[PDB]
Amino acid sequence: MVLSEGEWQLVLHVWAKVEADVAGHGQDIFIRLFKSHPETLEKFDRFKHLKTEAEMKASEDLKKHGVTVLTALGAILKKKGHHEAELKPLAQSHATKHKIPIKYLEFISEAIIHVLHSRHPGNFGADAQGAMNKALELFRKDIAAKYKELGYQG
Ligand code: HEM
Numbered sequence: 092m093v094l095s096e097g098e099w100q101l102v103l104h105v106w107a108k109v110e111a112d113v114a115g116h117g118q119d120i121f122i123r124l125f126k127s128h129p130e131t132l133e134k135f136d137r138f139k140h141l142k143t144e145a146e147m148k149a150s151e152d153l154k155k156h157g158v159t160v161l162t163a164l165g166a167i168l169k170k171k172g173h174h175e176a177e178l179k180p181l182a183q184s185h186a187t188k189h190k191i192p193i194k195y196l197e198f199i200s201e202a203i204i205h206v207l208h209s210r211h212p213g214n215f216g217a218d219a220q221g222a223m224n225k226a227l228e229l230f231r232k233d234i235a236a237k238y239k240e241l242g243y244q245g
Pocket residue numbers: 131132134135136137159160161163164180181184185189191195196199
């Protein structure tokens with residue numbers, strides 16, 4: 092898929108708001124993911140023991156991880172589709188070390204969209220959400236293609 096420049100400049104406009112508080116947004120997103128899809132928590136040896144949202148909010152380790160995640164994704168979005176180099180190491184670790192099925196990337200996409208909708212209604216009307224959806228779809232289709240080349244595709 093190709094995004095128009097107008098779609099990228101809906102994506103980067105709302106992303107600029109997220110970047111005012113990267114840790115806060117990272118926490119919201121992971122809690123939403125772990126609540127909506129508990130099976131995903133199982134993939135983190137580091138966080139599997141968290142039982143409640145309170146404990147998730149209280150974890151400084153999860154907060155740090157959310158920051159790493161969003162920083163990496165933000166580096167990707169800012170490339171506007173020219174993200175082949177950034178994707179290679181992420182695909183390799185998620186395919187071979189962590190073993191993350193595409194389906195779970197669909198789940199965190201949903202979590203991201205849910206949090207941007209909740210926190211930034213004014214900058215995330217229908218057109219901006221459609222743009223963000225296309226950007227994340229692009230990300231998932233490119234990572235899926237790398238998964239396949241790497242021998243994981245799943
Ligand atoms: C927006 C999509 C995501 C991005 C950009 C992302 C990014 C990252 C980055 C940069 C790291 C650290 C370096 C590395 O190991 O590659 C990481 C680690 C990790 N990721 Fe993701 N990730 C994503 C989605 C997921 C999902 C959906 C899952 C599981 C449901 C997952 C599971 C993990 C695990 C288990 C680790 C290692 C954490 C630890 O023990 O330190 N990731 N990810």
